[PDB]
Amino acid sequence: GLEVDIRHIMLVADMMTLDGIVRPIGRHGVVGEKSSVLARAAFEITVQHLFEAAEKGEVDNLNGVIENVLIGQPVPVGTGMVKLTMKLPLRPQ
Amino acid sequence: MYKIVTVKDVVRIPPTMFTMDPKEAAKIILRETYEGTYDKDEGVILSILEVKDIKDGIIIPGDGATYHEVVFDVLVWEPKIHEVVEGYVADVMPFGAFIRIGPIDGLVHISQLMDDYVVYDERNKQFVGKEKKYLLKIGDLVRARIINISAKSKVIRENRIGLTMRQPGLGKFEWIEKEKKKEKEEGKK
């Protein structure tokens, strides 16, 4: 009897079947395929991810949300994607 | 020695100067930021000349002040090692003589003042050659060669410059004239 919109289900399924195979949502699936090192290390296994990333010399480009929160920088979502420009000379009416 | 450099730079223009046009505001911000400082690669920033092109402002989160790409010319004076220097002696000291080379003062060591031995006469606080009977006093106009440049920090006062004076073609203009007389005499003999 619970009503959820179809679009959320579509988003989850499309993210789950994005690699050509059906893969889990947890640490061995969609999360484990995240490129960001800190985002993966924040979820579940932490020391293993950090040690293996140091082994291969992985780079964290900080293109996601989790790591930008960890460091304390704007996340690239919502108001974080808005680029603003302004003409300098302001003349009050 | 003096030169003009065209520099591209980003100017943080605070909201309090939003009323005036971008050119003057960028000029002022560059006066406060660059003018009166020492740069490791170009010398001493003396005066911002003018700004040609200023871009539209970019608002970045956190401050709200506009950031503009700018193009401007800066009058900068660059000392170069192993060059020639024209200047007057501002003051003298027992360890060396201070030679005015522009925005900053240079130091001429007593071991580089003359091939002859020199002694620091305290009667007028001046140098005097032992056997040449030459002398250096505050206000004398001399020609020397820059040999060493040292740059600690962006403060012009702290950075020091050392010159040489013994090498041929240098000296007080009277001594240069005397050397020219000797050259003429040896060419006539």
From Swiss-Prot, chain A:
Instruction: Name its cellular compartments.
Output: Cytoplasm
Q: Which domain of life is it from?
A: Archaea
Question: What binding partners and quaternary form does the record give?
Answer: Part of the RNA polymerase complex. An artificial construct of the RNAP clamp domain (including part of this protein) contacts transcription elongation factors Spt4 and Spt5.
| Described purpose of this protein according to its UniProt entry | DNA-dependent RNA polymerase (RNAP) catalyzes the transcription of DNA into RNA using the four ribonucleoside triphosphates as substrates. Forms part of the jaw domain.
The text of the family note is: Belongs to the RNA polymerase beta' chain family.
What is the recorded name of this protein?
DNA-directed RNA polymerase subunit Rpo1C
Organism per entry: Pyrococcus furiosus (strain ATCC 43587 / DSM 3638 / JCM 8422 / Vc1)
Q: Source organism lineage? A: Archaea, Methanobacteriati, Methanobacteriota, Thermococci, Thermococcales
Stretch of the intact protein here? 299 to 391 of 397
